[PDB]
Ligand binder design. Structure first.
Ligand SMILES: *C(=O)/C=C\N[C@@H](C(=O)O)[C@](C)(Cn1ccnn1)[SH](=O)=O
Length: 269
């Protein structure tokens, strides 16, 4: 019946919708097109920050990276502000997560794998985490621009949640480093209208959004019940019918998250 609720969202928003919530002790897994591929968009910036965190000591976050206005080829609200003084690796992670800064993400890719191998290196951190399905093939902004049906720069709701689960609720990062990722996602500025909107205020939410062409809108989150019970939420969508310039629908994601919140919070004693 929840599948039918999701189907209606799709009909109404003229859109394809992907949802995954892993099973916990107390709940079943929520799945709707969980193994269909969806463009990553900026959602990759979360596991990217984990990858830089993991490969280096915390000292590495103080490394000043300089770049130029030449390097800014995508929306970079923080990297623009710091073009002349440079940004540190920590600042970059800050911007990548909290502002979805494209330049910031492209520098972390270079830090991770050098020039020319950052995508390979990021995909390999996911492989190290037992995700064989996901893949990153390009930098910003081109990763946001592949056609529907192209496997390049795709993940699936299933895969990316299971990765986020490991990153936030598992040991893929130690506590000093995991906390920093969580603090950055917790302080996200781009996600108020997606998973966050679908959940009561006394549930805690950390998240990383995505947005892109063909009406792509993503959100991945980790949510906490008022009594600290955690869940992973992956919600992904596109709207290929409108062409490359089609309107993405944040409302579609908030509705989905509301269905999920509905399930996870109603207690049936
Ligand atoms: C961020 O999560 C993923 C994509 N961001 C896009 C967006 O914010 O809509 C762009 C990178 C925006 N853009 C236009 C020109 N340069 N950047 S994507 O639409 O290209």
């Amino acid at each position: 019946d929840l599948a039918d609720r999701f189907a209606e969202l799709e009909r109404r928003y003229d859109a394809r919708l992907g949802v995954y919530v892993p099973a916990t002790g107390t709940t079943a897994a929520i799945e709707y097109r969980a193994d269909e591929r969806f463009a990553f968009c900026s959602t990759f910036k979360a596991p990217l920050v984990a990858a830089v965190l993991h490969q280096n000591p915390l000292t590495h976050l103080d490394k000043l990276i300089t770049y130029t206005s030449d390097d800014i080829r995508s929306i970079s609200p923080v990297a623009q502000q710091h073009v002349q003084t440079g940004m540190t690796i920590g600042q970059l992670c800050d911007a990548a997560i909290r502002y979805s800064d494209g330049t910031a993400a492209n520098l972390l890719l270079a830090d991770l794998g050098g020039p020319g191998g950052g995508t390979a290196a990021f995909t390999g951190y996911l492989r190290s985490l037992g995700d064989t399905v996901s893949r990153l093939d390009a930098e910003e902004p081109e990763l946001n621009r592949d056609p529907p049906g192209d496997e390049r720069d795709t993940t699936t709701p299933h895969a990316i949640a299971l990765v986020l689960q490991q990153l936030v609720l598992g040991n893929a990062l130690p506590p000093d480093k995991r906390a920093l990722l969580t603090d950055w996602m917790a302080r996200n500025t781009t996600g108020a209208k997606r998973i966050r909107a679908g959940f009561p205020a006394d549930w805690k939410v950390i998240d990383k959004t995505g947005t892109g062409d063909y009406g792509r809108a993503n959100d991945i989150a980790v949510v906490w019940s008022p009594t600290g019970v955690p869940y992973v939420v992956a919600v992904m969508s596109d709207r290929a019918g409108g062409g490359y310039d089609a309107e993405p629908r944040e409302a579609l994601l908030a509705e989905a998250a509301t269905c999920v919140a509905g399930v996870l919070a109603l207690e049936h004693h």
